């Protein structure tokens, strides 16, 4: 297992514009197009992202291209963030993937919101972090995904992602 396989499990793959769990227009492997209510606004973002007239539909290779970019950007975002970098640097490889997964979902700003949990992770208090992570809108809104990421932080293994 690796970050790519992990996110493909959590996000799925869809080749037509769809609305995510928050109702925002999305395509591919969780690539957010826009928070605007307008389908036209989303189609225009899509075309600009892909570099062609797509009419709301993309290929598998295009989806994977967006995904590669988005994972690289989340990794580079963590490494330039003064709050996140010291946490990521402290973690083992499996737990680093869990942090990337959170940043991919909710952005840098949203994760820097979890400062209590981040301080517990940096100190390697895994059971305590896992409890604090769950007291969040994130856990309440997407509990099955949150539980997989939290389990990965608690254990430092890929066990939540094997068998599905």
Automatic annotation (TrEMBL):
SUPFAM superfamilies: Lysozyme-like. PANTHER family: T4-TYPE LYSOZYME 1-RELATED (PTHR37406). Endolysin with lysozyme activity that degrades host peptidoglycans and participates with the holin and spanin proteins in the sequential events which lead to the programmed host cell lysis releasing the mature viral particles. Once the holin has permeabilized the host cell membrane, the endolysin can reach the periplasm and break down the peptidoglycan layer. Its main location: host cell. Keywords: Antimicrobial, Bacteriolytic enzyme, Cytolysis, Glycosidase, Host cell lysis by virus, Host cytoplasm, Hydrolase, Viral release from host cell. GO terms for molecular function: lysozyme activity. It is found in: Host cytoplasm. This is Endolysin. One of its GO terms (cellular component) is host cell cytoplasm. The active site is at 11 (proton donor/acceptor), 20 (proton donor/acceptor).
């Amino acid at each position: 297992m690796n970050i790519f396989e992990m996110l493909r499990i959590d996000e799925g793959l869809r080749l037509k514009i769809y609305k995510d769990t928050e109702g925002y227009y999305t395509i591919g492997i969780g690539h957010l197009l826009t928070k605007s209510p307008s389908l036209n606004a989303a189609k225009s973002e899509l075309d600009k992202a892909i570099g062609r007239n797509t009419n709301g539909v993309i290929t598998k290779d295009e989806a994977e291209k967006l995904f590669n970019q988005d994972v690289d950007a989340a990794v580079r975002g963590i490494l330039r963030n003064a709050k996140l970098k010291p946490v990521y640097d402290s973690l083992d490889a499996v737990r680093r993937a869990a942090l990337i997964n959170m940043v991919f979902q909710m952005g840098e700003t949203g994760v820097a919101g979890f400062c209590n949990s981040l301080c517990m992770l940096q100190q390697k208090r895994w059971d305590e972090a896992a409890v604090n992570l769950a007291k969040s809108r994130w856990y309440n809104q997407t509990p099955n995904r949150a539980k997989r990421v939290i389990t990965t932080f608690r254990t430092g293994t890929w066990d939540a992602y094997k068998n599905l």
